[PDB]
Amino acid sequence: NHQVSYFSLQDVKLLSSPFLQAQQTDLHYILALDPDRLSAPFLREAGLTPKAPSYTNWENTGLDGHIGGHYLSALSMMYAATGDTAIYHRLNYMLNELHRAQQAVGTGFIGGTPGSLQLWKEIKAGDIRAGGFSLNGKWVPLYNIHKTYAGLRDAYLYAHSDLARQMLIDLTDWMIDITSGLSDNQMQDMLRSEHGGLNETFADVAEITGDKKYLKLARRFSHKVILDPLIKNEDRLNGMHANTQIPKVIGYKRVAEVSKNDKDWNHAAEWDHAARFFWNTVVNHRSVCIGGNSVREHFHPSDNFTSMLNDVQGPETCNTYNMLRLTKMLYQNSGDVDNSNKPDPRYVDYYERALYNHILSSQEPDKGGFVYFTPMRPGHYRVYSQPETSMWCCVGSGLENHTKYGEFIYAHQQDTLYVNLFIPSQLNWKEQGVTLTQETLFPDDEKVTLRIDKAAKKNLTLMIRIPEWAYEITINGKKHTGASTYLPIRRKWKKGDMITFHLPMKVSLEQIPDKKDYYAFLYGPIVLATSTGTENLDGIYADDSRGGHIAHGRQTPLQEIPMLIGNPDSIRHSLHKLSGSKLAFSYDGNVYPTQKSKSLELIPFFRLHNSRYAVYFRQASEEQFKTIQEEMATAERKATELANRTVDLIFPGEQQPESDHSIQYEASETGTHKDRHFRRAKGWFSYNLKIKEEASQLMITVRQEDRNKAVILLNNEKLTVHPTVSKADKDGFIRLCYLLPRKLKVGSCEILFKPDGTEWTSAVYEVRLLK
């Protein structure tokens, strides 16, 4: 049939490696969560009495119920991988509690969003008030319920719960009823609010049941404004919130898989193609070396990574989790597209890069804790979640990440096995009566062995992946380019057979994709990093506060971080492998400033924890050293000085900064000009500024040619002091700097913008509070 299939997690057992460690640490974190707290939002909205308070953080500020969704997925997948009894009891319990909630309402509805029944009543009637991250005064409710749809799906598919299947079908039938009276225009209006991968889950329900009404529902939930450009090979992603988009694209691809033999619809190949193009543009133009994307959750321009190297909010972990889910889908049928009937190993090159360097790095391996933002800025650190405090999106996906490292190691195609990832594992290839063990100390050693533990004397082809970054193969003791490919080995495999091969690894120096003067060291597919200090690791284990996912500690000026001096080729050659069982390197070349520790020590980024770090280093030629150092010593130092005086910061029109500052508005809009986001209002808009130290100054950014004006109120007191207008920057933005008449005291403070004798407010692009 040529169909490539994936193994279930039951049939791929992880052996001793960093991936098994990560699985076991995640198991401990999953088991630390209290199911009564995660179920509490659901019971409340069903009119039942909760057994415990919900979690705080996002679980009581509008996204109540989203972690419960992920919890079902993570439980279900971890159960499939491990067979853990404690997990089993938790999953059974959680499913039954949500079942009680579903019975109490009796329509199929399950949800945690505060005032859910009121919300979905409004929507069914055609009262749809959508913003980018809001629907009828609620925080991304469609995104929220998607995690339940996905959770119940996963409980059926991975854990074999018939109860979950029935719960999922009732919940999907419920949404058919909610949307039965809405036009396509109304649907697409509603889908302007972030809605996760609802279209994926509804396509999943179509495959599970075999009923095309769910496939009709999936297409109605496919957001057209994103899809239509991607069909025509157009990247319009600049300025967009990135994690919003990737689950839609997963969705479009899934609709195409499940619609492959629908006679009444002929748009499958188009939707498939659109997803392939999306993957192409994000991976090859918008991704850093660790495999992630986005800055402050948003796609910056692909010709300008300045913000990637300057902002502490580097790639979000959810985005990579989702990019890997998309990768898995695209690889599966990649042979059908090019008509080779052979899947494309370049998808695996990316899978490996992102899994080893971003997913594996995003969990603290001993204590546990999940990362939201991984700064690519040289010399900052990343913040970890804690079980009871942190209810972020990146916790949710974090719980899922480490359950399923077995999922992409192999793939099967009739009589053919693809050996894709070099991860110690035992495979049960039941369809050919084969058991197989892969052993390797990779990435700390080059050798891989594949032992046939059991076989039924049938002719089978092992397709061994030969990566870009890597041909002698020893079969049964018998000894026997430059492109992602596969080496076929066909034998009547019997018990005791042994395939030995080596993966040659080299140092590369990989430039930031827009070709600015920044480079990271890699060894094979492993991103290396240096530890730059352990000072001011503020909130490294997060509390439950809004914005506790961000690394808010002191910003170090870039001139204090090691800068690589010379030509890239000699820089690359000056990194030297140290001896020992683990990957470790020293950079022994020209550096600025002087290194007191003699030389720079680099290790795999996935092992660098509880520390500030550089992955990308600033580079400078000897010719350009003077002017580069002047820029870093003056302009960059002052920008760091500004950040270290900053007490609070809001980016209007960016959903999480606004959500974190308790955005309220009346008759308001958001948008983009010159790659910066803004909000404005005909009515008003407001935030709560959170003030850890006393503040002397407020600093508002507008465009100079915007002739609309704004009154500013601070706790209802009108600010009448005249701003110090700065010179307009290249793109037409000016800062208004207001010396406040009294200091804002430690605590909270409302800032409100309403129009000053014009229709709109000024479009505000930044709100910053300074000492």
Added chain:
Amino acid sequence: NHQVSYFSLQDVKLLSSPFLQAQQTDLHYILALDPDRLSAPFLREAGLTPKAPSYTNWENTGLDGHIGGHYLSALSMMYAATGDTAIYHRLNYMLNELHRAQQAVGTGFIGGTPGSLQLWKEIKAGDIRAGGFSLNGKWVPLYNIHKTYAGLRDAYLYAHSDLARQMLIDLTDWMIDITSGLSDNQMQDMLRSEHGGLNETFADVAEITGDKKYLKLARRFSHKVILDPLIKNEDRLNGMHANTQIPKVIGYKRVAEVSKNDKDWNHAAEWDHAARFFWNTVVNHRSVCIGGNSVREHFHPSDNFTSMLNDVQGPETCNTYNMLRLTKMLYQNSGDVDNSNKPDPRYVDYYERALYNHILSSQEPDKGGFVYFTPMRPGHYRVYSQPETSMWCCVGSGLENHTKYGEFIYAHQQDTLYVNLFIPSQLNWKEQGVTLTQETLFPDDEKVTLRIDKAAKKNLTLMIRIPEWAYEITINGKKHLSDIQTGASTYLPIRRKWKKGDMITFHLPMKVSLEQIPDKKDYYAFLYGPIVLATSTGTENLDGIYADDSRGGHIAHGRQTPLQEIPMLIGNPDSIRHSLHKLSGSKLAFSYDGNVYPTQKSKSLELIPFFRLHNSRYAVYFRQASEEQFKTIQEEMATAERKATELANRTVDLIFPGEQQPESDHSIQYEASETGTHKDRHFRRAKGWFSYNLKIKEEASQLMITVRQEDRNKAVILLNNEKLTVHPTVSKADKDGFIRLCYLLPRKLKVGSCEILFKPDGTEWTSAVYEVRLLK
């Protein structure tokens, strides 16, 4: 300072090669033109008495003066390359005649457009009536005068005429005065009419004079509706006339070069970036293997090359000429963008591909004659211009093309020479006291030798381009292996104290590749190294292969061959690729020794370089099929494609409303009319009326009009003012909603001309008409 510079044409002498042949053939064609005929439009509009009638064709049907513009450029550049005295005398004469015209009016105006003074008076006052290809009833006058601006610039920069400089400044100052009373809105409205690269030329005048007012004028003449998407990495080019857009983008890039140190404007990198993105999208998504783009002069969708493989109007030559000018600009500062101080050789990969396969193929090498359209349809031919008859845009650019093959062979950067094209040449590198000779029989042999003929004992780096499609070199007998640095295109540095008598030998390994049509339909062309190969498929019905002066004589109107009669490659692409084998002899020649249908009874299919294939029908792209799918593919081609060919071979005349050249060729008139696109097809309609003259070479029985089915607006049809009242036979609607109305005429239209006029039939608009076809 690590800036890359180009050599002047005076310092790069072409040696014996196909490029020198092409230069010398173009010289003969340039000298065949009568300067009194080319100057006649200019003298007329100045109120002077011409010494001869203007040329016919486009020189008396609205674009009068456009070839005179190009003539100045071609003369100037050919003078620089050759030092030919006859060229010098022609240029001097032409400049003086246009100077007399400029003096007679005395405002700075020089132009050939009929009623020029009246036109520019209207425009200065703010009476602007712009269409896509018209301004105040005149055919692309801004495009026309651009050729004069460019011609005078070239006479200064290449030939060192101070008179041309002064004429250029007066003409630019004249346009400052014309546009001094117009708002930005009015400018941008006027720029909806095709205007060539006026913004480029005005930026050129800014650099020549050093006065920023010309740079301000250049930005005012930059069309924003095209620029603004390109700044944001958005390709919206589908449906657009392609040669209209590329000179604007050249313009935007040139404004960025000349604005590099302007403190009062900070948009240079944006405009530079927009041009780089444009180059990227056209080359990597919209270009065929010969390096060209467009079908019927327009950008089709990049996921659908069906029209590229069906239509006799393949890539236009002007587009590649212009793409190569943009390439040269982008390569020059490419090292500054990535801050490597090393220019990007992938620009050269394209330059080579387009130069060898499109530009070099577009001139008949012995007789002369320039090509307008190069069909990628399997089994058609291309039409050549003739000196006295053909005044097309592609003649104008054609005259320029072959003057300047010396321009991109090398580049220099202080102590570094880039050896980019493998073209026999003698280089005068005055800046390092070096004379150098490149000798090679490439593409017919792999060996290149570089001889140092003169040097001043300085350490200098020769950067030898190593193309994608291609490491042992030899300096003075001694062989020197270096590591194969990458599969990708790169430069090999060789640094010595070069002295007289030194010799660098290297080889360029060439392989057969099989390049698929970019949308991945089952069509492939053979290449050997960067050379596109082709097979000759016959010499039947080469109608108008040397064009007369008629409207539409640029198109290859001969009988279309059914695709089933053309060789189809049978088997998997890998085996197809391996089955092409090099024949012996000094010249590139191949036989395809694999499976072909229809079958070859006598000899294998013979493939040669497309640039040597002339006076013949050809295939570059072949249809491909597996052995499993062979039967059903042949059955499909024997019905549907055959019938489409049968229709075309019955066709006596054809018009595509809303496409500028078909309409212009059929004498478009209208009142209260609009054009536009639906489902990738162009249309015109009117509240007043619109009309054409149908040209009828043989007697015609039938008229066939295409509309959308759901358009409820209707049209009366008049043929020479007699109303056509016969009922059309309505065809079934195709997939995109289009129906053909087929009218059996009551009498045959006789051989000659005939007006067709559409006015509304009891509705506000006419029906939107997408095709008008006259059949026997």
